[PDB]
Amino acid sequence: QPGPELVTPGASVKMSCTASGYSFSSYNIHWVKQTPGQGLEWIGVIYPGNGDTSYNQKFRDKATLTADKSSSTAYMQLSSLTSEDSAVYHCARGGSGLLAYWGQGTLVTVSSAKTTPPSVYPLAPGSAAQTNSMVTLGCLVKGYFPEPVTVTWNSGSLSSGVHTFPAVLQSDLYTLSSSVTVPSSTWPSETVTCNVAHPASSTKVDKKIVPR
């Protein structure tokens, strides 16, 4: 507990490994930590056969592995949560000496950061080319925490040409862009929009891409 990703510094999370790895095996169960920079880190392995656990020296005091043969469960419980533990914790099922099956991937975010609503700014074209003529438009979603946000175009009518780029961390705050492309028979003549919604604190914005 829990898995909506956001937790307080000093808390203690507990995750579970579940999928359709089907009955039969699971002789060993590994746990992997993925993070932008440190890459893949091995926390430890549990052998559900008799309980035997192995831990990385780095995570021996912070990680605890349990598993039962009743509901095919396999848990990891962290504690003393620092913002260093902000990562994607994976699970790896398989037979003897095999990282065969991998799970979904539980996202974990540890931060003392306050919740901040996003602000959206329109991005007019101008003298900066967009390929094959047409009209490329977009919005700038800047300064929100935490993730994610959802961007649509023409109330959902407008697919194709849409390019919602991933968010770059920009000093404790997230920021992403999202381009879209329509013919000149739509812009600047008629409507283009652009709905950036932000779950965690709720927000809904409408931006008419008015020309420069």
Add this chain to the structure above:
Amino acid sequence: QAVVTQESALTTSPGETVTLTCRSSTGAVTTSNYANWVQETPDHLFTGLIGGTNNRAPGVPARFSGSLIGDKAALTITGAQTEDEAIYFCALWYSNHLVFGGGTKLTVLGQPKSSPSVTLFPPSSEELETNKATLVCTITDFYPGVVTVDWKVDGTPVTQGMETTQPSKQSNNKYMASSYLTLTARAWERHSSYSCQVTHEGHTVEKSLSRA
């Protein structure tokens, strides 16, 4: 904790045979290291391939195989496919401690190479009211998926206040990216030219705008 080294990147064509290696700084890679090989698809899915130096996980195609080349652990893909273009991670055992490698990003030429299309946006008027200015440069439709970006103000290079996203795969199996150059609204009115330079495979695509 020893360190595990892999090749940064390799490129090949379908039908060809490619060999990836896995080096250990603290001596050589023997049979007692129980070499592991995990694949990560650009959609971040994670699938286990090899365990115990040369044991294919159940379900892995016959084109994958592991072995020891001299003093290094190796992965061999004979008859590579277009679907094999992904990042491959290596893992070596040490007493009771599993160390992962940096990973090898393999590119498989399944489609013709393509120069990226670049769009550049000037800061919006609303953000200027907050004494901030953010130029947005969108980079889409390029292959292979490796791109470096540089910025230029008034024809002169700026390496400050820049931020570029990592390449993510598009729906047409191409790649896309973006970059942001943040300045003050004061600096936005105290210079003239702005340029976003995208270098892909020796060639440079450049898009500029002048406040006029």
